[PDB]
Design an enzyme around this catalytic site. Structure first.
Site, PDB file in Angstrom:
ATOM      1  N   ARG A  48       0.831  -1.196   0.000  1.00  0.00           N
ATOM      2  CA  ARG A  48       0.000   0.000   0.000  1.00  0.00           C
ATOM      3  C   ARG A  48       0.867   1.249   0.000  1.00  0.00           C
ATOM      4  NH1 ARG A  48      -5.213  -2.337  -0.571  1.00  0.00           N
ATOM      5  NH2 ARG A  48      -5.175  -4.323   0.577  1.00  0.00           N
ATOM      6  N   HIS A  49       1.674   1.395  -1.039  1.00  0.00           N
ATOM      7  CA  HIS A  49       2.565   2.541  -1.149  1.00  0.00           C
ATOM      8  C   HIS A  49       1.799   3.775  -1.602  1.00  0.00           C
ATOM      9  CE1 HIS A  49       4.772  -1.145  -1.947  1.00  0.00           C
ATOM     10  NE2 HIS A  49       4.251  -1.195  -3.182  1.00  0.00           N
ATOM     11  N   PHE A  50       2.482   4.909  -1.591  1.00  0.00           N
ATOM     12  CA  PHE A  50       1.895   6.165  -2.025  1.00  0.00           C
ATOM     13  C   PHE A  50       2.996   7.175  -2.321  1.00  0.00           C
ATOM     14  CE2 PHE A  50       2.529   8.138   2.102  1.00  0.00           C
ATOM     15  CZ  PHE A  50       2.442   7.082   2.986  1.00  0.00           C
TER      16      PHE A  50
END
Length: 142
Positions: free
Chosen positions: A87-89
């Site tokens: 769940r990168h950003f």
């Protein structure tokens, strides 16, 4: 599915997506299909090292390094906060004045402003800094 029509559902990958966004952010080519073909050969998402190499293969400069939130304000933005959970950003700005953080949601494909408690709750310490031959500053949105 499996009937000679889809074979395997194109399970979106925030990592690859982030690469695209960053690749596109730098105006550098990026073929998610080829990227996954070269780095996501496992079909389980771009790995940290596989992702880093994915950007490099695009003639795009990238490098994962362990930095502190207080440094993110000085790192090469927009930066990609690698998430072991996938769940990168993409961090684009930090409002230390308000303890907020402007990130790009790879799920909604839209920017967002998280709070320190939130960003801290998501941040792990490892972030990926990207740079391009033509854009080695990061601050493109003056």
């Amino acid at each position: 599915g499996a009937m000679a029509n889809s074979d395997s559902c194109h399970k979106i990958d925030y990592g690859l997506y982030a690469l695209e966004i960053l690749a596109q952010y730098h105006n550098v080519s990026v073929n998610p299909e080829e990227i996954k073909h070269r780095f996501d050969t496992d079909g389980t998402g771009l790995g940290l090292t596989s992702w880093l190499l994915a950007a490099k293969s695009l003639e795009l400069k990238v490098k994962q390094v362990k930095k502190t939130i207080d440094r993110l304000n000085f790192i090469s933005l927009p930066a990609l906060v690698w998430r072991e959970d996938g769940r990168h950003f993409i961090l684009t700005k930090v409002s230390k004045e308000a303890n907020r953080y402007l990130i790009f949601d790879l799920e909604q494909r839209n920017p967002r402003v998280l709070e320190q408690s939130e960003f801290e709750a998501l941040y792990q310490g490892h972030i990926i800094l990207i740079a391009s031959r033509s854009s080695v500053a990061g601050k493109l949105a003056k």
